[PDB]
Every structure is written in structure tokens, then in C-alpha cells.
């Protein structure tokens, strides 16, 4: 419906990985990890003596290549810390500027998936359990503390995400499976203080905050989740409040919104979701490359646009969690960010559009034309 | 019953 | 198998 | 060590 130029969002290409000598075989969800807009980590398994490329997106996409002997490697959201795992069992986390081994241990059961829950905490998911590690606590040989057990709805799925709230007492683990020819998503929600889990359908999940009128300067906590039904194709975005403070007068009213899928994208599904707390914007990215911008307080879709033709396989927050970055199958890392300085021109054009539409309606059956 | 109305 | 790489 |  619209072009990139006319929409009030700025589009950037942070790096072309393939123009840096990165082979297309390593541009997949398990080989190229994306934890923040600071580093890209490419695990190159090529002849036994595997290597890792760390692309520093901040310092002019500088490539630091080192030979590594593991089957997975990820970078810290902002520091120069690398976590490496081998056989799913031996885990070793290093600071690269102090040359110091922050952590080193061996789990009993292998780790299927891991991700940084916060600047301080790294989450692990095994075939049966969900664990968490404070890698900066000083205890080098300390194995991760068990968080909870995997809900049965996650069985026979591949875990693709692990998200937490800022207080680290609400968690969501996202797995997907193949169903009715499409991709179905399952989410385990977990409240730590209640020690209770809940099973929902969904491809994407995130926790965020929003200041509501009347609550002063105190935010309210909301959980955002996106799903597309593998059977019906219906897609839904849901925003629901968690742990409301009774001293606050205004609470977030649960919102549900339809997610749009064009007729050619029947096998598309949501792959990522990021939220700008500052601007109250939900960015929902799909695998085919469609970005949706929703307004956080009302859940209303502001606009939909196609930012890439190649499929995306991973995403992350961009700027200071004000936008969304993603890596497509080609290796382009693309960033999308709302730009308030472009909203006024966008509004002026929409006002012209509605004036013209009114005029043609008066050409039809609307009272007018004098 | 459930944690949330999801 | 990698579902996201399908 | 998995890295050096």
C-alpha cells in the first residue's frame, strides 16, 4: 500500500555480511546469532578447526576472527564477552578484553538453546529444563541455577526464543513446530514468584512497560505476544497487563488486534517482536520480511510495509531499544526505526488523501458538489 | 485457573 | 532440522 | 579451552 519513503520510518543497512567474506552456508538461525545491534556472531564450521567471526557493528563493522572448537557461540548485548558451548554440555564464557574466563562448567543434560535475558543474566533451555546464570557473579565454576521445568506444550518443538522482564520474575520460552503444512508456535509463560507456568499459542513474545494517564511517572507492565493459527491462518497480536499495582489508578485494558497477511503470504508467520518504550511502538516482523507498526496503548496497527524480499531468520532491538534490526537469508542486516521528525509530513499527506477521497465521494453519493 | 487471560 | 531455515 |  505504501513505500518506505512515504512512511515515517527510517531504513538502514547496518552491514552486508556477504561483502565481508561470510559464506552463505553460515547465514542461518543456528550459525549467525544476533543478540543486540552491537555484534553479529558467525560460527564457521568448515573443516573441524571451526572459527568465529565477530562483526562489531559499532566500530565500523570490524571483524575479529578466532578459531573455536564448539557447536554454538553468542555475544553479549553490549560488552565484549563471548559465550561458547560444545557438545551442548561444555560451556565456557570469556571476556575478550581482559582475556579472563568468566565462566566454565559442564551441564548434566545438553543445552538446546540459549540467549541473554538481560545485561547481567544468560538463559539456558535444555530438552527438559529452563536454567539461568549470573555470569558476572564471580563464581567461575558455578553451574546455572534451575529456573523451572519445560511445559509439555513445548515438547517436540524447537526452542527459538527466551525472554524476560526487567525484574527477571516473568519469563517466556518460545518454541515452534511444523503443523498442517505451516509453522505453529507455542509459548510457556512463567511467573517466578508464583512458581506457575501457562501454555499459550504464539510465535513471538516480549515484556515491556507503558505509562498510562493518571499513573504519574510510574509505568505499568505489559506482555506482548503474536501468533498465527496454523489451521485457520488467522493472526493475532495480544497485549495484556502483568502484576498490576493497586496503588496505581489506571490499568492497561487488554487489547487484541488482527495481524494482516496478504494473499501471497499464506505460509508467512511472525518471527520477531520488539517494542520502543519511549515511543510506545510495537514492531512485529514476519519471516517473509513484512514489518508491522502498532501503537502500544491501543494496539492499533499504524502501518504495514515490506522491508525485504529475502526471508529473515533472526532479529534484535535497534538503536537504544527504539527500533528493530534483523538479518535476512542473504546476510543483509536491516534496521527499521520510527522517526518522529517524519510524522508531520506523513500526516499532511494523509490529510490531503482524505480531502481528495471526500471530493470523489461527493462525486458519488455523498452530499456535496454544491 | 490461569495466570493471564491469554 | 531448522524450521526457520525452511 | 574452547577458545584462545
Residue numbers in the entry:
A (entry chain A): -2 to 367
B (entry chain D), C (entry chain F): 2 to 7
D (entry chain G): 3 to 6
Publication text:
The protein that gives the process its name, Clathrin, is a triskelion composed of three heavy chains (Clathrin Heavy Chain, Chc) that provide the structural backbone of the lattice, further stabilized and regulated by three light chains (Clathrin Light Chain, Clc). To investigate the existence of binding sites present in Clathrin NTD, we crystallized the N-terminal domain of Chc with different peptides derived from adaptor proteins containing CBMs. All our structures show that each peptide binds to three different binding pockets (Clathrin, Arrestin and W-box).
Crystal structure of Chc-NTD (displayed as a grey cartoon) bound to CBMs from Ent1 (1.75 Å, red), Ent2 (1.74 Å, yellow), Ent5 (Ent5.1 LIDL motif, 2.01 Å, green), Apl2.1 (Apl2.1 LLDLF motif, 2.75 Å, blue) and Yap1801 (1.95 Å, grey). The NTD structures for all complexes are very similar with Cɑ RMSDs between 0.36 Å and 0.64 Å (compared to Ent2 as reference between residues 5 and 336: Ent1 = 0.64 Å, Ent5 = 0.57 Å, YAP1801 = 0.36 Å and APL2 = 0.53 Å) with the exception of the structure in complex with Apl2 that shows the formation of a terminal helix (residues 337–363), transitioning from a helix-turn-helix configuration to an extended, straight helix. The presence of alternative secondary structure elements could introduce differences in the overall stability of the Chc complexes or could suggest a mechanism for transmitting signals from the N-terminal domain to the Chc repeat region. Concurrently, K326 forms hydrogen bonds with the peptide backbone at positions +2, +4 and +1 for the Ent5.1, Apl2.1 and Yap1801 complexes. Water-mediated interactions are also observed in the W-box between the NTD backbone (L24, D25 and V309) and the peptide at position +3, for both Ent1 and Ent2. In addition, the substitution of Ile (from the LIDL motif) for Leu further reduces the binding affinity of Apl2.1 (residues 718-726) for NTD (KDApp ≅ 245 µM).
